[PDB]
Write a protein that binds this ligand. Structure first.
Ligand SMILES: O=c1ccn([C@@H]2O[C@H](COP(=O)(O)OP(=O)(O)O)[C@@H](O)[C@H]2O)c(=O)[nH]1
Ligand SMILES: O=c1ccn([C@@H]2O[C@H](COP(=O)(O)OP(=O)(O)O)[C@@H](O)[C@H]2O)c(=O)[nH]1
Ligand SMILES: O=c1ccn([C@@H]2O[C@H](COP(=O)(O)OP(=O)(O)O)[C@@H](O)[C@H]2O)c(=O)[nH]1
Ligand SMILES: O=P(O)(O)OC[C@@H]1O[C@@H](O)[C@H](O)[C@H](O)[C@H]1O
Ligand SMILES: O=P(O)(O)OC[C@@H]1O[C@@H](O)[C@H](O)[C@H](O)[C@H]1O
Ligand SMILES: O=P(O)(O)OC[C@@H]1O[C@@H](O)[C@H](O)[C@H](O)[C@H]1O
Ligand SMILES: OC[C@H]1O[C@H](O)[C@H](O)[C@@H](O)[C@@H]1O
Ligand SMILES: OC[C@H]1O[C@H](O)[C@H](O)[C@@H](O)[C@@H]1O
Ligand SMILES: OC[C@H]1O[C@H](O)[C@H](O)[C@@H](O)[C@@H]1O
Lengths: 590, 295, 590
């Protein structure tokens, strides 16, 4: 098996997660005949990969057959023990002969990549290197086994045509997880779901680009022995646009972390929410005028797509929910996070300063705490109950007064934790300042935009993504166009209720698998049969309905949402890959 | 008190010089010049010239000693800069990561001691904690040099201190034997960074250099000597004049009286450099004895 | 060099400390030609010794020359890096032929050991083994060097006669640190210092025993090329009783631990006194009616000799000082420790229970402390100064009341921390209950008898001896008969003022080395020209005078006492051993 892809060592939301979750089961069920191919980027990928430059059995012949011939191929383990013997390929090591590879592409399939975008050039170069490695392996192994080559996305789709030109006896499977042409039309301010058969692919390809990419994608789909897509909705645009109906639907699964107790995810949520509460206390210093027990943490994560990931409708719903909470005289407050990576330069002074003063207050309270504890210990040793007024003197009251005065703040807490280099052109900040949300005292919702992926080694918010998601209360992902949707998937795996859409692969998958959804925390939101304003109103209604329920109802809802983890497990969802491999073997050679 | 305050200053230095802790901290001496922001009156130009010269001698002498010189002179700022707060944040993030590995190691060691078997030291730490230590080490990697000013001043092109610092080529580099930290604000016990009031910080330093040209009496050296810290006064100062005829043979009690009346500016700078180097050469025992004599 | 002795691996107050302190300088000045010989006891001595059974250079010939011949010889390092290549000898391994060794002793010097005491039989067996090892080494080394053999005490004195019988060409030095006959006459309720020339050695030897021991000691003194003693007072009884005037006086030194700062011993004293204060709070639970800042810690340590170490006079002085402190209306209190090992079975329930309730109160105060700190942190985060009455609720007051009630105690704290198996015959407890000292509320002095050596791994008092001594305030050692005195020596080395005697080697040594003593914390107490009652009165006066001075005076006195460490340093006191070695070399062979 060869699961060649571009995201194996570099962290990107797509491809990387599905491969990392699949590797364990796909290796334990099959064995050491599982091989993974990907690129090399000088970004720290070697930190997570245990490279094996020295010769190693289980395809030891290529190391002394081709490595010392002007190429660069490594063998790694990934630090994940699913037996993922990964074949890492360097991109910049072999780039001096791009002209001959372009000529080879011209001879074979009249395709290639223009010099405008280096991403696709690197993808094609990696495809050439992968094809050379696979051919060398077949030559060295005397063609005794019939290996199956599987391809993900267009970043590794040139392998299909390269192998078909050379007629290598392998079973070809191609699985596209996102028709990028659909992605770039859905961002073109044009309706995409009302009609699909009225699109002219060649006319649209090129004004927004995606002409060579579309051509190579369709060539791979046609020439691949087995074609596959993520959701049933994915197959719909695949057969209507690429004119190649997928052989079988292959829903995306996850490696659920089973605990010895059913309620351990609740404890993880409690701890992570405590950490988020510490961050909130840091950010809203001098403005802690709202109860923190009535605070709910909403969030929308993923790549920074405004109209595709559904951030405009979420912000409109947040403004409306703020208006209803203000006019209803409610003590509930909602802190909404926005984890969408936009380029910054560093943090702003306000956020780091807020964390600093929060922990300075923590230190001052600690000091008074040890002094009080020592005096109380003396009193208990003597045998007299404290009268509570003889312990604290004038100096510690003086320093508490000084600390309180130092934390006084007149400006409002910032909406962005980082210092972005383009604030006049950022959609999120623009609409935030348009809808009049500035974390004010009167505001019932507080927006925090964290334009960066979460990491466990960050100066502020020392939580990785999974822990932070476990800490939140509701994940709102009203995405207009996205094939499957991972973020709601692990939200429901970790027990957090989520707001999906009927235009999403996750929402569609959970639509017909459960009778009466939204009773299990899956607030499916209709975006196909409703206008934008109606969808915003429905999102506001869903948010308010989540707000009105008490703590017991929230706990019960989280339990019900967690109970659905078995649907997205790779044990249940891995059978489709096995079926695809069986069809590929039957088509190529029994 | 000096030991505790120097420990706090060491924590601040570790925060500021994160990813650049290539110098021994036991060979680090903390000089400072405090008071109101007068350049030619409080003697900040001559101090910076002497700092540059002492850096040159320490570099050409192959010395392991390093000197961190503080400049507490209030100039109007707007807030801190991102680099300094970020440095404190990553320092205490490393502290938290080391703490986490520390509790895990302590629990495993407690289990081993309860069983009755001496640790073999390789069965305790697994792959995950090594992974997070590697990630923490990578996160603290830094390519830019530590800043010379902890705050964000609104006029850097017209500040005398920063101008002469960038003129004398001092940027807290790895090769630099002296590191300059300009803190344009009075110290306070309730500050987000450096949570020390002025007296505690002065107790933590090693030598207070106040080569003031014109000032009537001089308080800063007075409480420096009251708290035991050796000081460098001048014969144009009221404190220096007062201590001149009250003690036979000064500079044997930590009062490095510096002549600025009968000497030119260059000669005064050379004498200040000689005094700084002489303070640098003496060992820990000599420093302790000198602090006792000054107290 | 061969510093053969019985206390090299087993912990005994004498011999062990002097050898362990000397080894560093005597090895750094000379080198790897330094060899140490001692016995083997199955008591954990191998834990502190890195045995080298495998062959090792620097006398590698004996390992393959004699070890595989029915004997048992090891090579060790001691874990002390003074280069102490120690030659460890097993005692029980070679004991099957004691009859032939007894016959050899009869042939050589008409000496030996009767079967009443196994200590001296083991000593003689170890002496035979040492002589065999030394002879084998000379045979293997072709007698190229002229090694010097030095002997300590009568536990290794048979080596002198054994080597003299065989006429081995070595330079013999013998250093007796205690004339044991003097020790056992001074405990016989007979005056010993008024006259020395009127004693009949043979008549006294045997009724109290020490006949064979005395004979072999005097034979070693006569036959040794160089004879040496600890103090000038030691030489006095040596020449008047053994009839062999020592060649030179060899005062006992110590390896002083120099710190980078002069005042570090003050900080060590502060920390150790804090630990002793924790122990006192544990022991006196429910009876902490006295200020702990006015508490002074006196102690008398060493082996359990009542009339020789001066414990009766110390207890009489403690009772008198208690009477004066009571009638003077003083707030000062004195806790007097008695570290004298007597056999026990385990601790008593009261002391362990007291430590337990002390740390239970510590835990309860801690719990209230975290609750208070969290509430205070919330208040400071809000921005409001605490009003100090809204934080503590009824439950934590309830548990503080319950804890206070649980620590109520009606019986007085015990005087002995352990459970001794003979309380009706213990001199210390007998005189304590006679002088009416029971740690009462009215008592101004509190006596704690700890019948065991201090250790760092004890369930209570987790302090080794040096740390505890650093923590105390005054070491009272009014010893009647003891040759030199180590305990006051390291008391003054570590800065603690001490009360020595003019009958002591340390007191005599410090008498003529400093003008006007007792101005440096050395309270020399006259016991030769004064009666017992007068000595007790002088001790009471010294204790009261120490009590009256304030904290500043105590600190200054500790500084002055610490300044005298250079007198007892081995650098200054090691020249006498060098002189003795030079005389031995001159007498044996130039
Ligand atoms: O701060 C973040 C936010 C998102 N993700 C990852 O990004 C993926 C989102 O994938 P999705 O299919 O939702 O959309 P994509 O970002 O791939 O377009 C999830 O698997 C997350 O694990 C992350 O690692 N850190
Ligand atoms: O960070 C600082 C620096 C200086 N000072 C005070 O400023 C005074 C300096 O007075 P001096 O006579 O040296 O000169 P002045 O500043 O009055 O001109 C000293 O007493 C210090 O206590 C302070 O409080 N904090
Ligand atoms: O709790 C104790 C008490 C005493 N000692 C040691 O016992 C020795 C006392 O020797 P000294 O010459 O005072 O009298 P000895 O006990 O040898 O007769 C000192 O060196 C101490 O180090 C000890 O290790 N722990
Ligand atoms: O954050 P909430 O919705 O109020 O949930 C409250 C918390 O949920 C879970 O983490 C646990 O059951 C906690 O015990 C509970 O306090
Ligand atoms: O900072 P230094 O000059 O090296 O002084 C070293 C320190 O001085 C004092 O604070 C104390 O004596 C400390 O015990 C000592 O370690
Ligand atoms: O126990 P005392 O005799 O009262 O001595 C008091 C203590 O002595 C030394 O340990 C130190 O100087 C301490 O700073 C001091 O508090
Ligand atoms: O369909 C699988 C997932 O990965 C894809 O590459 C897309 O980035 C994401 O939107 C999709 O949900
Ligand atoms: O002379 C007394 C002190 O206070 C004065 O006001 C000056 O500011 C200062 O330089 C002087 O040393
Ligand atoms: O004289 C040296 C020291 O060790 C001796 O063996 C005695 O036990 C002790 O009292 C003496 O002070």
């Amino acid at each position: 098996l060869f699961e060649v892809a571009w995201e194996v060592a570099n962290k990107v939301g797509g491809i990387y997660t599905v491969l990392q979750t699949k590797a364990k089961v796909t290796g334990d069920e099959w064995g050491d005949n599982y091989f993974l191919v990907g690129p090399y980027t000088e970004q720290g990928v070697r930190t997570q990969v245990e490279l094996l430059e020295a010769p190693t059995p289980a395809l030891k012949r290529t190391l002394d057959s081709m490595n010392s011939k002007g190429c660069k191929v490594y063998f790694g383990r990934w630090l994940i023990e699913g037996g993922p013997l990964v074949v890492l390929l360097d991109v910049g090591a072999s780039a001096w002969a791009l002209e001959r590879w372009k000529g080879e592409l011209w001879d074979t399939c009249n395709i290639g990549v223009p010099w405008y975008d280096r991403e696709a050039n690197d993808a094609v170069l990696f495809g050439f290197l992968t094809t050379w490695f696979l051919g060398e392996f077949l030559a060295q192994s005397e063609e005794k086994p019939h290996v199956v080559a599987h391809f993900h996305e267009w970043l590794a789709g040139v392998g299909l045509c390269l192998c078909r030109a050379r007629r290598l006896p392998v079973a070809t499977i191609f699985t596209t997880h996102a028709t990028l042409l659909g992605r770039y039309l859905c961002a073109g301010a044009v309706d995409f779901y009302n009609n699909l058969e009225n699109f002219n692919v060649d006319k649209e390809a090129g004004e927004r680009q995606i002409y060579h990419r579309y051509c190579m994608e369709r060539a791979a789909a046609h020439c691949a022995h087995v074609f596959t897509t993520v959701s049933q909705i994915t197959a719909i645009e695949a057969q209507h646009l690429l004119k190649r109906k997928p052989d079988i639907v292959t829903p995306n699964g996850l490696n659920v972390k089973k605990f010895s107790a059913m309620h351990e995810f609740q404890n993880l949520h409690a701890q992570s929410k405590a950490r988020i509460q510490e961050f909130v206390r840091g950010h809203f210093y001098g403005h802690l005028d709202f109860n923190l027990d009535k605070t709910l943490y909403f969030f929308i994560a993923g790549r920074y797509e405004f109209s595709n990931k559904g951030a405009d409708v979420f912000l409109e719903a947040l403004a409306r929910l703020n208006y209803l909470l203000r006019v209803n005289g409610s003590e509930q407050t909602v802190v909404a996070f926005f984890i969408m990576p936009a380029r910054t330069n560093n943090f702003n002074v306000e956020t780091l300063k807020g964390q600093a003063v929060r922990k300075q207050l923590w230190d001052t309270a600690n000091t008074v705490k040890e002094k009080f504890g020592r005096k109380l210990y003396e009193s208990l040793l003597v045998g007299s109950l404290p009268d509570m007024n003889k312990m604290l003197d004038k100096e510690d009251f003086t320093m508490m007064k000084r600390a309180i005065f130092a934390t006084q703040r007149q400006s409002f807490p910032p909406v962005c934790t980082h210092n972005m280099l383009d604030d006049s052109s950022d959609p999120i900040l623009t609409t935030i300042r348009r809808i009049g949300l500035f974390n004010s005292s009167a505001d019932r919702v507080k927006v925090i935009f964290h334009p960066e992926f979460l990491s466990s080694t960050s100066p502020l918010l020392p939580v990785d993504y999974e822990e932070f998601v476990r800490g939140c209360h509701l994940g709102v992902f009203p995405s207009y166009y996205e094939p499957w949707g991972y973020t709601p998937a692990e939200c429901t795996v970790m027990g957090i209720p989520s707001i999906s859409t009927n235009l999403s692969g996750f929402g569609c998958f959970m639509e017909e698998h459960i009778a009466d959804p939204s009773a299990y925390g899956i607030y499916i939101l209709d975006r196909r049969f409703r206008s934008l304003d109606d969808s915003c109103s429905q999102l506001t209604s869903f948010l308010y309905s989540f707000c009105q329920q008490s703590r017991r109802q929230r706990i019960i809802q989280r339990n019900r949402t967690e109970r659905l983890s078995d649907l997205l497990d790779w044990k249940y969802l891995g059978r489709y890959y096995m079926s695809a491999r069986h069809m590929a073997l039957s088509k190529a050679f029994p």
